[PDB]
Amino acid sequence: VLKLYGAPMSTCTSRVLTCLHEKNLDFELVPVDLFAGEHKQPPFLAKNPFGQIPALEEDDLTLFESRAITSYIAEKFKGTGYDLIRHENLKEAASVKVWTEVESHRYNPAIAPIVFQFMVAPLRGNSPDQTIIDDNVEKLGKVLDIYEAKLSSTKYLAGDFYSLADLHHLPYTYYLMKTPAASVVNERPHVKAWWEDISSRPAFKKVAEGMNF
Amino acid sequence: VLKLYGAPMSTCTSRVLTCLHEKNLDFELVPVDLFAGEHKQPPFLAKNPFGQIPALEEDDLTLFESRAITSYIAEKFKGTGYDLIRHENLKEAASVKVWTEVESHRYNPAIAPIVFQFMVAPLRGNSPDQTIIDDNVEKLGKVLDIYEAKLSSTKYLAGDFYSLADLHHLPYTYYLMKTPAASVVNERPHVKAWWEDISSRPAFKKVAEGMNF
Ligand SMILES: N[C@@H](CCC(=O)N[C@@H](CS)C(=O)NCC(=O)O)C(=O)O
Numbered sequence: 055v056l057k058l059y060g061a062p063m064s065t066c067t068s069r070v071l072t073c074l075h076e077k078n079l080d081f082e083l084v085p086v087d088l089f090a091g092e093h094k095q096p097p098f099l100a101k102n103p104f105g106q107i108p109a110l111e112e113d114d115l116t117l118f119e120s121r122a123i124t125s126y127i128a129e130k131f132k133g134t135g136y137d138l139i140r141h142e143n144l145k146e147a148a149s150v151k152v153w154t155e156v157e158s159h160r161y162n163p164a165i166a167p168i169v170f171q172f173m174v175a176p177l178r179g180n181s182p183d184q185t186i187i188d189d190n191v192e193k194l195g196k197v198l199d200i201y202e203a204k205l206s207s208t209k210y211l212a213g214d215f216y217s218l219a220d221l222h223h224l225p226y227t228y229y230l231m232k233t234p235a236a237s238v239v240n241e242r243p244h245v246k247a248w249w250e251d252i253s254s255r256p257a258f259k260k261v262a263e264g265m266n267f
Numbered sequence: 268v269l270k271l272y273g274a275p276m277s278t279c280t281s282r283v284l285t286c287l288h289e290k291n292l293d294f295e296l297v298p299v300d301l302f303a304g305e306h307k308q309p310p311f312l313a314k315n316p317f318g319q320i321p322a323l324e325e326d327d328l329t330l331f332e333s334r335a336i337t338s339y340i341a342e343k344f345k346g347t348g349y350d351l352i353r354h355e356n357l358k359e360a361a362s363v364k365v366w367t368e369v370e371s372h373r374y375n376p377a378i379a380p381i382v383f384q385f386m387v388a389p390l391r392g393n394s395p396d397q398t399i400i401d402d403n404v405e406k407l408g409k410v411l412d413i414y415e416a417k418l419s420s421t422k423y424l425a426g427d428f429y430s431l432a433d434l435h436h437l438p439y440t441y442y443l444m445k446t447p448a449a450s451v452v453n454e455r456p457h458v459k460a461w462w463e464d465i466s467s468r469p470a471f472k473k474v475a476e477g478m479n480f
Pocket residue numbers: 064065066067088093105106107108118119120121372
């Protein structure tokens with residue numbers, strides 16, 4: 055059984071959950087109690103020594119890092135459910151690799167701090183830092199300027215097909231759109247339409263429920 | 268023929284060069300003049316709209332992001348040269364994915380600003396910012412504390428085999444070891460031996476020469 059350790063409301067778990075649904079896979083979501091600090095105790099640290107969710111146990115295999123887990127799932131269950139990494143087109147598969155790396159090294163480092171300040175900082179007892187928000191909204195805008203041009207050429211980031219590249223953007227963007235920083239998406243027409251597209255896929259709509267209130 | 272656009276002395280290009288050598292592949296290195304701002308002009312922007320090196324062309328295929336390029340090479344030529352991704356052991360393969368994601372999301376964000384301050388800031392006309400250095404040295408230390416424990420259990424990050432996960436660490440770490448921040452590697456005995464191991468591989472020694480003045 056694919057056993058996913060995490061929480062429905064977290065961006066990092068949701069990234070895997072939507073991938074699991076795209077692939078039409080059975081799985082078990084095992085709750086990890088972040089409130090009680092379960093992720094920092096010896097049992098979970100043995101799954102992920104960095105003490106963050108999610109982790110995956112599949113028989114004797116144990117994985118962590120959300121995008122390692124999605125990549126594993128996408129590769130292992132080739133030909134089942136949606137074709138996320140393009141297993142029968144080399145050119146397409148390569149482009150997916152490009153834009154998943156763009157998400158990791160360009161999109162995520164800019165959007166993560168925005169969501170952290172709005173959603174996580176209050177949990178740590180701090181008001182959102184407007185300076186950190188504004189700086190990264192500027193940075194994300196510049197990434198999104200490139201996205202706007204790309205998405206004017208192709209339906210999705212890696213080409214005229216939905217892929218793992220787009221998928222990885224769903225969770226942090228979902229929370230961004232709940233904040234005033236939603237403006238960076240809404241003011242770029244191709245990015246906005248792209249977001250409205252991928253965020254309305256059945257495989258994410260089921261996951262979106264768990265990310266709400 | 269594989270055409271790599273970049274510069275020997277750059278970490279991002281060096282990351283691809285070492286992979287090419289591990290895979291025993293022939294290639295053409297096409298210089299891009301950063302000092303002259305070539306990477307910011309339309310011809311190169313047509314290759315990478317983000318205007319940074321490296322980029323790869325193979326026939327009509329064009330790629331950017333260093334780790335997308337290494338992944339593409341390691342996959343396409345998986346059956347020949349060194350087994351970077353473990354193409355015959357799906358569990359080892361999964362482990363490599365975990366630790367390449369660790370390099371992208373945990374190691375690189377901590378080590379990059381350190382190297383930037385030491386080696387790029389003077390090209391900006393500034394002295395190295397010791398505050399940014401110290402803060403990220405603290406961060407990198409926490410990451411390496413985890414590595415230290417993992418490398419007590421297996422010879423390399425993903426297991427007892429060298430892999431793409433280890434490889435991706437080579438370039439920034441190489442420049443780190445030329446600075447006072449080399450201490451974070453040298454003070455952790457398993458991390459130190461692991462570094463001295465992977466950095467002595469013939470596929471990297473060829474590359475390290477181009478990273479020296
Ligand atoms: N790079 C990691 C990031 C993991 C991460 O940020 N997890 C968050 C949830 S979204 C977490 O565990 N927060 C609890 C904490 O750090 O105390 C991944 O993609 O899996």
